[PDB]
Design an enzyme around this catalytic site. Structure first.
Site, PDB file in Angstrom:
ATOM      1  N   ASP A  88      45.545  40.352  35.882  1.00  0.00           N
ATOM      2  CA  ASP A  88      44.628  39.246  36.025  1.00  0.00           C
ATOM      3  C   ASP A  88      43.809  39.277  34.750  1.00  0.00           C
ATOM      4  OD1 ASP A  88      42.647  41.055  38.496  1.00  0.00           O
ATOM      5  OD2 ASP A  88      42.535  41.085  36.321  1.00  0.00           O
TER       6      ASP A  88
ATOM      7  N   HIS B  93      36.203  45.114  40.923  1.00  0.00           N
ATOM      8  CA  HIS B  93      35.792  43.714  40.951  1.00  0.00           C
ATOM      9  C   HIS B  93      36.572  42.960  42.019  1.00  0.00           C
ATOM     10  CE1 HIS B  93      39.028  43.221  37.649  1.00  0.00           C
ATOM     11  NE2 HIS B  93      39.542  42.882  38.817  1.00  0.00           N
TER      12      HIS B  93
ATOM     13  N   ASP C 111      39.167  50.376  40.165  1.00  0.00           N
ATOM     14  CA  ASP C 111      39.634  50.961  38.910  1.00  0.00           C
ATOM     15  C   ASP C 111      40.103  52.388  39.181  1.00  0.00           C
ATOM     16  OD1 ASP C 111      38.169  51.155  35.551  1.00  0.00           O
ATOM     17  OD2 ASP C 111      40.088  51.874  36.319  1.00  0.00           O
TER      18      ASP C 111
ATOM     19  N   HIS D 271      30.392  46.458  48.726  1.00  0.00           N
ATOM     20  CA  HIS D 271      29.961  45.548  47.680  1.00  0.00           C
ATOM     21  C   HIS D 271      31.076  44.560  47.327  1.00  0.00           C
ATOM     22  CE1 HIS D 271      27.694  44.484  43.942  1.00  0.00           C
ATOM     23  NE2 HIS D 271      28.912  44.331  43.447  1.00  0.00           N
ATOM     24  N   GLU D 272      32.281  45.069  47.087  1.00  0.00           N
ATOM     25  CA  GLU D 272      33.379  44.193  46.673  1.00  0.00           C
ATOM     26  C   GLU D 272      33.765  43.209  47.783  1.00  0.00           C
ATOM     27  OE1 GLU D 272      33.008  45.630  43.033  1.00  0.00           O
ATOM     28  OE2 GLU D 272      34.114  43.871  43.709  1.00  0.00           O
TER      29      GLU D 272
ATOM     30  N   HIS E   6      31.698  40.203  47.736  1.00  0.00           N
ATOM     31  CA  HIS E   6      32.223  39.184  46.830  1.00  0.00           C
ATOM     32  C   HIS E   6      33.445  38.469  47.429  1.00  0.00           C
ATOM     33  CE1 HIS E   6      29.516  40.184  43.628  1.00  0.00           C
ATOM     34  NE2 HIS E   6      30.080  41.340  43.325  1.00  0.00           N
TER      35      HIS E   6
ATOM     36  N   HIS F 286      25.456  38.354  43.345  1.00  0.00           N
ATOM     37  CA  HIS F 286      24.606  39.527  43.248  1.00  0.00           C
ATOM     38  C   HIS F 286      23.193  39.284  43.767  1.00  0.00           C
ATOM     39  CE1 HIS F 286      27.393  41.434  40.019  1.00  0.00           C
ATOM     40  NE2 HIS F 286      27.667  41.897  41.227  1.00  0.00           N
TER      41      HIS F 286
HETATM   42  N1  LIG Z   1      26.374  51.162  35.412  1.00  0.00           N
HETATM   43  C1  LIG Z   1      26.421  52.035  36.321  1.00  0.00           C
HETATM   44  O1  LIG Z   1      25.420  52.614  36.717  1.00  0.00           O
HETATM   45  C2  LIG Z   1      27.778  52.340  36.904  1.00  0.00           C
HETATM   46  C3  LIG Z   1      28.468  53.391  36.048  1.00  0.00           C
HETATM   47  C4  LIG Z   1      29.302  54.317  36.917  1.00  0.00           C
HETATM   48  C5  LIG Z   1      29.876  55.416  36.049  1.00  0.00           C
HETATM   49  O2  LIG Z   1      29.572  55.462  34.830  1.00  0.00           O
HETATM   50  O3  LIG Z   1      30.640  56.248  36.592  1.00  0.00           O
HETATM   51  N2  LIG Z   1      28.638  51.173  36.806  1.00  0.00           N
HETATM   52  C6  LIG Z   1      28.424  50.147  37.625  1.00  0.00           C
HETATM   53  O4  LIG Z   1      27.520  50.132  38.455  1.00  0.00           O
HETATM   54  C7  LIG Z   1      29.310  48.957  37.450  1.00  0.00           C
HETATM   55  C8  LIG Z   1      28.613  48.172  36.347  1.00  0.00           C
HETATM   56  C9  LIG Z   1      29.362  46.949  35.846  1.00  0.00           C
HETATM   57  C10 LIG Z   1      28.578  46.488  34.641  1.00  0.00           C
HETATM   58  O5  LIG Z   1      28.691  47.141  33.579  1.00  0.00           O
HETATM   59  O6  LIG Z   1      27.831  45.491  34.760  1.00  0.00           O
HETATM   60  N3  LIG Z   1      29.217  48.132  38.640  1.00  0.00           N
HETATM   61  C11 LIG Z   1      30.296  47.683  39.275  1.00  0.00           C
HETATM   62  O7  LIG Z   1      31.461  47.914  38.951  1.00  0.00           O
HETATM   63  C12 LIG Z   1      29.988  46.868  40.491  1.00  0.00           C
HETATM   64  C13 LIG Z   1      30.748  47.550  41.597  1.00  0.00           C
HETATM   65  C14 LIG Z   1      29.879  48.185  42.648  1.00  0.00           C
HETATM   66  C15 LIG Z   1      28.510  48.073  42.939  1.00  0.00           C
HETATM   67  C16 LIG Z   1      28.236  48.889  44.063  1.00  0.00           C
HETATM   68  C17 LIG Z   1      26.948  49.114  44.774  1.00  0.00           C
HETATM   69  C18 LIG Z   1      25.855  48.281  44.556  1.00  0.00           C
HETATM   70  C19 LIG Z   1      24.669  48.510  45.236  1.00  0.00           C
HETATM   71  C20 LIG Z   1      24.594  49.572  46.139  1.00  0.00           C
HETATM   72  C21 LIG Z   1      25.687  50.405  46.365  1.00  0.00           C
HETATM   73  C22 LIG Z   1      26.869  50.173  45.680  1.00  0.00           C
HETATM   74  N4  LIG Z   1      29.366  49.497  44.476  1.00  0.00           N
HETATM   75  O8  LIG Z   1      30.365  49.045  43.577  1.00  0.00           O
HETATM   76 CA   LIG Z   2      35.981  51.775  34.807  1.00  0.00          CA
HETATM   77 ZN   LIG Z   3      41.683  42.861  38.884  1.00  0.00          ZN
HETATM   78 ZN   LIG Z   4      29.379  42.816  42.080  1.00  0.00          ZN
END
Ligand SMILES: NC(=O)[C@H](CCC(=O)O)NC(=O)[C@H](CCC(=O)O)NC(=O)CCc1cc(-c2ccccc2)no1
Ligand SMILES: [Ca+2]
Ligand SMILES: [Zn+2]
Ligand SMILES: [Zn+2]
Ligand SMILES: [Ca+2]
Ligand SMILES: [Ca+2]
Length: 159
Positions: A66, A79, A94, A114-115, A118, A124
Site C-alpha cells: 500500500d 496504521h 509493523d 487504537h488502530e 481508525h 486522533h
Molecule cells: N513516538 C513514539 O513515542 C512511538 C515510538 C515507539 C518506539 O520508538 O518504539 N511511536 C509512536 O507512537 C507512533 C508515532 C507515529 C508518528 O511518528 O507520528 N505512533 C503510532 O504508530 C500510532 C499507533 C499507536 C498509538 C497507540 C496508543 C495511543 C494512545 C494510547 C495507547 C496507545 N497505540 O498504537
Molecule cells: Ca516502525
Molecule cells: Zn499498510
Molecule cells: Zn492513529
C-alpha cells in the site's frame, strides 16, 4: 463526519501472525481490542478465517503493498484505513516492532485498540489520556479504560 460502516455486524480476519508472540495471545489481544469498542457501541465483531472479512489484520514490514511504507524498528508502529471496501478498514502492524502481551516492547492489545479506532472511522484525539491520542504509551492492561473522549467519538459515529 468521516466514513462509517453502514452495518452493525462487522467481520475481521487475522491474515498472518507475528512470530514475536504465541498465536493464542495474538488472537486474544485482537479479540479483546474489538471488545473494547463493541462495549460502547451497537457494533458486533466476528472472526472468520475464510471469505470476505471487513477488517483484515496484517503484520508486515517496510514497503508492503500500500502506499504507506513502514520504517523499521521504532517510529511508525502500525496504521489503519478508515471504513470502506477492499483495503478500507484494514489494520497493519509493523513486524519490525517487538509485539508483546505486556509492557515490554510494544503491547499489541493497546496498539490494536487504537488502530481499530481508525478502522471504525475515528481520527486522533488531543486528550493525552485518550486511546486515540497519536502516540503510543503503555498503560496497565488490567485497568485499561477508554477515555470519555474516545467514547464520545465512537458514539458520534455509531449508531
Ligand atoms: N513516538 C513514539 O513515542 C512511538 C515510538 C515507539 C518506539 O520508538 O518504539 N511511536 C509512536 O507512537 C507512533 C508515532 C507515529 C508518528 O511518528 O507520528 N505512533 C503510532 O504508530 C500510532 C499507533 C499507536 C498509538 C497507540 C496508543 C495511543 C494512545 C494510547 C495507547 C496507545 N497505540 O498504537
Ligand atoms: Ca516502525
Ligand atoms: Zn499498510
Ligand atoms: Zn492513529
Ligand atoms: Ca477491508
Ligand atoms: Ca517483530
Amino acid at each position: 463526519m468521516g466514513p462509517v460502516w453502514r452495518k452493525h455486524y462487522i467481520t475481521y480476519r487475522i491474515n498472518n501472525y507475528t512470530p514475536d508472540m504465541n498465536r493464542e495471545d495474538v488472537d486474544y489481544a485482537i479479540r479483546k481490542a474489538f471488545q473494547v469498542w463493541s462495549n460502547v457501541t451497537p457494533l458486533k465483531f466476528s472472526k472468520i478465517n475464510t471469505g470476505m472479512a471487513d477488517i483484515l489484520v496484517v503484520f508486515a514490514r517496510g514497503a508492503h503493498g500500500d502506499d504507506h511504507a513502514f520504517d523499521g524498528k521504532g517510529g511508525i508502529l502500525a496504521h489503519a484505513f478508515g471504513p470502506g471496501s477492499g483495503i478500507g478498514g484494514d489494520a497493519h502492524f509493523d513486524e519490525d516492532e517487538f509485539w508483546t502481551t505486556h509492557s515490554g516492547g510494544t503491547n499489541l492489545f493497546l496498539t490494536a485498540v487504537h488502530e481499530i479506532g481508525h478502522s471504525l472511522g475515528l481520527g486522533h484525539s488531543s486528550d493525552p489520556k485518550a486511546v486515540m491520542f497519536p502516540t503510543y504509551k503503555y498503560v496497565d492492561i488490567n485497568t485499561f479504560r477508554l477515555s470519555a473522549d474516545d467514547i464520545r467519538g465512537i458514539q458520534s459515529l455509531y449508531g
